[PDB]
């Protein structure tokens, strides 16, 4: 049935895919000063379509900021912020991205769409690979 199967898997047959380095939330404990530290699973590659979102600059406290966005369609269960849970993280073009929204569709269909915001430049390995 069409709401079953995997529509994004079929759609990936024609359109191309970008390989992102996904990384899943594992647990999180508080370090000192009550700031709270997140920990994650092992990274793994993910085939996803990372389309753009129009990012517009704004002004706050007389400074100029801009929030960088990407909308990722991926054939995986992606979970952002949740009660007793922090968001997931994926690397693309040497940039970290954390999920902000959640289009779900996983348990219905197996795929998902999420809006993700850039966090900062990725760490560079000794060999030149752009992962943590």
């Amino acid at each position: 049935m069409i709401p079953g199967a995997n529509l994004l898997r079929m759609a990936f047959g024609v359109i191309g895919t970008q390989i992102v380095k996904y990384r899943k939330f594992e647990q999180r404990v508080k370090n000192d000063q009550a700031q709270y530290v997140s920990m994650f699973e092992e990274p793994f590659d993910l085939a996803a379509s990372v389309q753009r979102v129009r990012r517009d600059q704004y002004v706050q406290f007389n400074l100029e900021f801009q929030r960088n966005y990407v909308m990722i369609f991926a054939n995986f269960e992606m979970v952002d912020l949740d009660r007793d849970v922090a968001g997931d993280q994926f690397l693309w073009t040497g940039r970290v991205f954390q999920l902000e929204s959640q289009g779900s569709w996983f348990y219905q269909d197996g795929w998902g769409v999420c809006l993700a915001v850039d966090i900062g430049a990725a760490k560079l390995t000794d060999d030149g690979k752009p992962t943590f």
């Binding site: 600059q57 406290f61 100029e64 954390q98 915001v117 900062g120």
Partner: protein, 183 residues
């Protein structure tokens, strides 16, 4: 006519306070910037200090002194107006949970305040033609930066007192021609 020179001197003093703040507590570099940048230019990841002009309150009536030029017999009047400007001095430094030598933007703002209220810095600033009044509050507020995280942008108002001089012209006189009338 003074805010340019004042902003230069304040930038020098703020950079000095940042060099001192690099000693007690440690930051990766620092920057001192004016908040309202006249061209589109970004906020900096590094721990920085912002300053901006807020008001200008003249204090007391202007004081007029008379100075003879001795050449054209013109009394140049010098109108000195006292001024208390108010500078909004803020700080910005994102906080990394992983690091252990944590230092908060509140620390940087508090150290700037305490440095600028010390008596030695007051005497130095006096030697640089202005002074500093009391800072009675430092407001640590929270907001969302562009990465959808949480950041603090502490700020306080520093009152700086100085003088500004105006030169104008007036006519002189070296005579006394009275009329002694009888009732």
């Amino acid at each position: 006519m003074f805010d340019g020179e004042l902003i230069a001197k304040m930038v020098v003093e703020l950079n000095a306070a940042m060099t001192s703040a690099q000693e007690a507590l440690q930051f990766p570099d620092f920057e001192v910037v004016q908040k309202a940048q006249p061209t589109q230019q970004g906020t900096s990841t590094r721990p920085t200090i912002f300053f901006q002009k807020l008001f200008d309150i003249p204090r007391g009536w202007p004081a007029t002194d008379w100075h003879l030029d001795n050449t054209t017999r013109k009394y140049v009047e010098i109108t000195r107006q006292h001024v208390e400007t108010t500078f909004q001095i803020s700080s910005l430094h994102w906080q990394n949970p992983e690091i252990t030598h944590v230092v908060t933007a509140s620390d940087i703002a508090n150290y700037v305040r305490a440095y600028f209220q010390a008596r030695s810095t007051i005497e130095r600033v006096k030697e640089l033609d202005f002074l500093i009044l009391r800072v009675s509050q430092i407001s640590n507020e929270a907001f969302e930066n562009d990465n959808h995280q949480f950041e603090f942008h502490p700020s306080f108002d520093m009152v700086v007192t100085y003088n500004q001089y105006i030169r104008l012209y007036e006519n002189a006189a070296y005579s006394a021609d009275g009329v002694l009338i009888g009732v």
